[PDB]
Amino acid sequence: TYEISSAEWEVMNIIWMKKYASANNIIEEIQMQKDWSPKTIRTLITRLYKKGFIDRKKDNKIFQYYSLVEESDIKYKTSKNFINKVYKGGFNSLVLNFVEKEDLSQDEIEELRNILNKK
């Protein structure tokens, strides 16, 4: 019923990769990159759970969290919002700004074209 912060995106990205993950599995993966405590990280998991983004499945052993939101759509909708707030030429503007600013590689430029050719 709202929208994700930078740390929930972190937590979420791990949950969309591991398909099913534990509070500890999540802390381990998150701690390889951020110096955040476990409290802090479980608080993010509890909150993500309370707003509905994820749920927690069991069956004996240990508690596991999983996604309730489609990765593809909350990321699409988030990019739509980002583009709507920063650029005044829609998606095309962002691509033009990125391409002119980053010296993309021949291999990067080529993956790009493939993505435009497949639809």
Place this chain on the structure above:
Amino acid sequence: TYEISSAEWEVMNIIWMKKYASANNIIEEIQMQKDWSPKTIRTLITRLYKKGFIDRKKDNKIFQYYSLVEESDIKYKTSKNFINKVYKGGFNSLVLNFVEKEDLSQDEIEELRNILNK
């Protein structure tokens, strides 16, 4: 750079679109699509001023604000940050993802090709 808000962005996009503009100018370009008061907008101007994003020169005895930062440089930086926060792939996955949930006409694809190509 120091990650600015959507309101701040609304203001910057006006300073950029006019090189120099006084509060009053800003207040009205803003009050045309936003229901913001005069003090709200003066606070946004003052906030970007203290953050080093804009500065002011006294023409007449009235302050005229202009940018201290390079629009495309700041929007680029901002884009890298957004992509690092949300996507794991990179610019790649955002374009992949966008080219896949936005039906996009067949010309939009052509225009997107322009950029990449010419």
